[PDB]
Design a protein around this nucleic acid. Structure first.
Ligand code: K
Ligand code: K
Ligand code: K
Ligand code: MG
Ligand code: MG
Ligand code: MG
Ligand code: MG
Ligand code: MG
Ligand code: MG
Ligand code: MG
Ligand code: MG
Ligand code: MG
Ligand code: MG
Ligand code: MG
Ligand code: MG
Ligand code: MG
Ligand code: MG
Ligand code: MG
Ligand code: MG
Ligand code: MG
Ligand code: MG
Ligand code: MG
Ligand code: MG
Ligand code: MG
Ligand code: MG
Ligand code: MG
Ligand code: MG
Ligand code: MG
Ligand code: MG
Ligand code: MG
Ligand code: MG
Lengths: 244, 122, 157, 77, 38, 46
RNA sequence: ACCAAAGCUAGCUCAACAUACUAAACAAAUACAAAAAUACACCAAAAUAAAAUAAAACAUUCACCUAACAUUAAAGUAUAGGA
RNA sequence: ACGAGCUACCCAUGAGCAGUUUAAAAGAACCAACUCAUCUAUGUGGCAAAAUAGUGAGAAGACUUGUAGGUAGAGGUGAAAA
RNA sequence: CUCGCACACGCUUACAUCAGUAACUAAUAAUAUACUGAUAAUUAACAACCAAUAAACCAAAACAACACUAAAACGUUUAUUAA
């Protein structure tokens, strides 16, 4: 006896039934798209085809990403899409030498960052690559709102984006109750990232969080059979009334 | 060794281990350690008067049976609440907002014997 | 007493009939035990079977009135609150609720019970599916074999 | 000075709140709806428990100054 | 941020398929470290 | 000096070392319960 | 002449099809020392699989060995190997 | 993964040491309960997968002992016998 | 001829009344505390379960008068609460 559906598709088919089926389509579409993240550790080669120096012939070359381990400590901060690199190495960089387990760890720093959308300071464990990406995007808010999920790789970042994305769509007057002119200036620069309300509250949710949110919205107490039967009786009485 | 496939009861363990056999507690421990038995927690059995009641545990063999019709929530409504609703609607006195006069109760916590929490044991 | 006969009786009537049955059942149990003590057969033991059947029918009809009245007022199928939970073993268990004087988050004992499956339970949950699949697969093939076997010995078709 | 408390023996401080509570204008998703712990969901923050009806044995001890005979002057007994 | 490359070559998979990864493909060598650059 | 009686019975020790409560307190212990449930054991634990 | 001998069912194996995949039973009690109605909580966690073996030794290496999306060929070819 | 219910050591909580000799409750002395096991003889598929009989050493201490808890194999523990 | 009664820990009806033992159990027979069938039983005063906070209090058990060094288990009262 064998399974009719292969085992690898059990998780995919889990999303097609039950509460997962009633989830909004826009959330599901973004979840199913598994795009390759921006290369961080390994250095990719631009050319798709390369010439073998030994063979002097045209050959095909492909970039293979190097697996990287993300510890749970990373999810509380902004590491810029990097983490521990687990692998082996050769001592003295000689092939005929001993094979040695080696772990490379990023250098972490403690900084507090300022976000214009939320006007709050967060003390976030950041890496030197994250600060370079902040300067590259010309703004902390730009860095969060421009880098996609696969590039950020942090639940804090997704929640930080979702907090600011809802702030823009709702156009909350609580950003600066005393400076309406300052409020207009802040939201004017990020006008290209504005998304509708139905899209801005599902960008930073995981699979477990969304199901709880979906259940909470659909949590309805059962309708008593007295109310159902009363409506049924009234329809018959009106039907009989209109028949005379 | 010991038997791991038997029932673990109070008789097997030491003097410290004293597990009840399934009774329902009827009190607590007071100041001096004397067991203070709460009067309310004791199940007060309620009995009717069977002296003037004519009925027996057995039925005559010649008595015919009946078509087994389990009671339905729809049949009960058509038997009790439907005649009152139907007469009121024909007279124009039906009020969709308030149905308390027909036996409907919005919240159960007001009454003494709830239904969904199942307050009464039996 | 049959089920239909008790539906014509009032709730007050059923309450009084329960104790008439109750006194009858106690007497029959006393006689049955005394029969064993005297090493003699119980006179007409089918009386006890009739009484317990009457008791169950009386319990059924009152329960038929309780749930029907509950559905009209509240619409809940079950009289004891509960919700479907996934225990540590990965199964789906209908967790009945219990009465407490303090909320769920202020309970020391309740907050120690776990309702969720750890990642290592996924492999064991998968194996239970395979075990049940093989049991059902063996059962289905056994039914086919018997049908072929009986046809050969009974070629009436 | 040398305080007589010990860090291990003293009651631990509450765990740090989840980062979701720090984001202005964002409703956190908690497991309080399912009234049991679930990994991946934020820990709820509950208001102090307020029993509508006071119970003699199980209530908290009233403060000393709540007693009617409490007086500011210190009397030695 | 460290930059590493594999010692052993990885066989190709040109139809958009994830390539087969072996134990000997875990052997990395540090070619450059971003913190030591000017 | 005369081995063979290494088992000295005790209910307090037996229920604390191999009890059902202890089996569910450690992640490795729960796997022991899962293995015995899969195998079809009549008694998962003491 | 004892001890013994003979029987053909119980069920199983490998597939195929296939719904789409933790069965049956859950009245009460079940993670206090499980199956004990009832009190102010703490709750939780991850770090590359290794080696037996092959190279007639053994250190670099040793298919499958967690995660492939298949079949006919290109082909055991280009390449990678104390080469 | 599972094992400190036997054993090595330790943390809790308990319980025993009668008589005799000495200003002595002095890791003193005679000798029981109690704890170890020196020598020899039976036993060697035995009563016993390490015992029985006689005889021995300590017996107010670095002593015996009950209940329960702690340390787990690249380790634990050890008045080193690997 | 002399390890006897009871509790704790453990075992779990192996205990009691009546009947049967050709055979099963006892390393044999009689036979029945030990094997089979039926019926019956251990009744709480003893034992388990059996309050919280604040404050005063340097002063050993060894017949304990009073001392030794190794510095020692063993709580009462007042106040605020306690179905
Ligand atoms: K232990
Ligand atoms: K012996
Ligand atoms: K026994
Ligand atoms: Mg056993
Ligand atoms: Mg006991
Ligand atoms: Mg006992
Ligand atoms: Mg009393
Ligand atoms: Mg191809
Ligand atoms: Mg043994
Ligand atoms: Mg012992
Ligand atoms: Mg070799
Ligand atoms: Mg060979
Ligand atoms: Mg290998
Ligand atoms: Mg080379
Ligand atoms: Mg021990
Ligand atoms: Mg003496
Ligand atoms: Mg001496
Ligand atoms: Mg001897
Ligand atoms: Mg001898
Ligand atoms: Mg002699
Ligand atoms: Mg001596
Ligand atoms: Mg001497
Ligand atoms: Mg362990
Ligand atoms: Mg060692
Ligand atoms: Mg020693
Ligand atoms: Mg030596
Ligand atoms: Mg040696
Ligand atoms: Mg035995
Ligand atoms: Mg005999
Ligand atoms: Mg007899
Ligand atoms: Mg008997």
């Amino acid at each position: 006896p064998l399974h009719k559906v292969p085992v690898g598709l059990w998780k995919q088919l889990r999303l097609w039934e039950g509460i997962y089926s009633r989830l909004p389509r826009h959330y599901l579409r973004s979840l199913e798209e598994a795009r390759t993240p921006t290369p961080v550790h390994y250095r990719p080669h631009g050319a798709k085809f390369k010439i073998n120096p030994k063979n002097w012939q045209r050959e095909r070359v492909e970039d293979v990403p190097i697996p990287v381990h993300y510890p749970p400590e990373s999810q509380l901060g902004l590491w810029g899409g990097e983490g521990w690199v687990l692998g082996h190495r050769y001592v003295n960089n000689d092939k005929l030498s001993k094979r040695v387990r080696k772990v490379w760890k990023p250098q972490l720093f403690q900084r507090e960052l300022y976000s214009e959308i939320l006007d709050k300071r967060f003390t976030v464990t950041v890496t030197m690559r994250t600060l370079d990406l902040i300067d590259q995007a010309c703004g902390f808010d730009f860095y969060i709102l421009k880098t996609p999920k696969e590039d950020l790789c942090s639940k804090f970042g997704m929640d930080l984006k979702r907090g600011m994305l809802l702030r823009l769509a709702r156009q909350d007057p609580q950003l600066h109750p005393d400076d309406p002119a300052r409020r207009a200036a802040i939201y004017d620069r990020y006008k290209a990232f504005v998304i509708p309300e139905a899209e801005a509250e599902w960008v930073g949710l995981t699979l477990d969080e969304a199901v709880e949110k979906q259940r909470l919205l659909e949590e309805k107490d059962p309708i008593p059979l007295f109310k159902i039967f009363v409506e049924e009786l009234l329809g018959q009485l009106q039907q009989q009334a209109l028949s005379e | 060794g010991a038997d791991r496939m038997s029932k673990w009861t109070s008789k097997r363990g030491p003097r410290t281990f004293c597990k009840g056999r399934g009774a329902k507690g009827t009190g607590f421990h007071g100041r001096d350690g004397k067991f203070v038995q709460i009067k309310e927690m004791i199940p007060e059995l309620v009995v009717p008067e069977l002296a003037g009641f004519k009925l027996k545990p057995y039925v005559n063999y010649r008595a015919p049976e009946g078509t087994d019709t389990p009671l339905t929530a729809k049949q009960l409504f058509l038997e009790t609440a439907a005649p009152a609703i139907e007469k009121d609607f024909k007279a124009g006195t039906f009020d969709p907002e308030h149905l308390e006069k027909y036996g409907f109760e919005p919240t159960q916590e007001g009454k003494l014997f709830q239904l969904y929490p199942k307050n009464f044991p039996r | 007493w049959t089920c239909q006969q008790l539906r014509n009786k009032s709730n007050e009537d059923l309450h009084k009939l329960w104790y008439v049955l109750l006194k009858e059942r106690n007497m029959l149990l006393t006689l049955e035990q005394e029969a064993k003590r005297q090493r003699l057969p119980m006179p007409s033991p089918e009386r006890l079977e009739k009484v317990v059947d009457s008791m169950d029918a009386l319990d059924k009809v009152v329960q038929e009135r309780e749930d029907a009245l509950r559905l009209l007022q509240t619409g809940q199928e079950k009289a004891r609150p509960g919700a479907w939970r996934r225990d540590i073993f990965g199964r789906i268990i209908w967790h009945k609720f219990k009465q407490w004087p303090i909320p769920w988050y202020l309970n020391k004992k309740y907050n120690r019970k776990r309702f969720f499956a750890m990642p290592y339970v996924e492999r064991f949950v998968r194996m239970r599916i395979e075990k049940q699949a093989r049991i059902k697969a063996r059962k289905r093939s056994l039914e086919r074999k018997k049908e072929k076997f009986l046809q050969e010995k009974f070629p009436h078709l | 000075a040398y305080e007589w408390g010990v860090r291990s023996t003293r009651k631990p401080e509450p765990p740090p709140l989840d980062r979701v509570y720090e984001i202005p204008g964002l409703e956190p998703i908690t497991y309080a709806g399912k009234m049991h712990f679930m990994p991946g969901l934020a820990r709820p923050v509950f208001p102090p428990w307020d029993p509508g009806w006071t119970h003699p044995k199980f209530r908290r001890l009233p403060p000393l100054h709540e007693h009617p005979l409490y007086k500011d002057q210190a009397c030695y007994v | 941020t460290v930059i590493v490359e594999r010692w052993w070559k990885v066989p190709l998979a040109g139809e958009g398929r994830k390539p087969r990864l072996h134990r000997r493909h875990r052997v990395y060598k540090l070619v450059e470290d971003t913190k030591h650059r000017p | 000096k005369a081995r063979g009686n290494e088992y000295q019975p005790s209910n307090i020790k037996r229920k604390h070392k191999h009890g059902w409560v202890r089996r569910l307190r450690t992640p490795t212990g729960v796997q022991v319960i899962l293995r015995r449930m899969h195998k079809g054991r009549k008694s998962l634990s003491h």
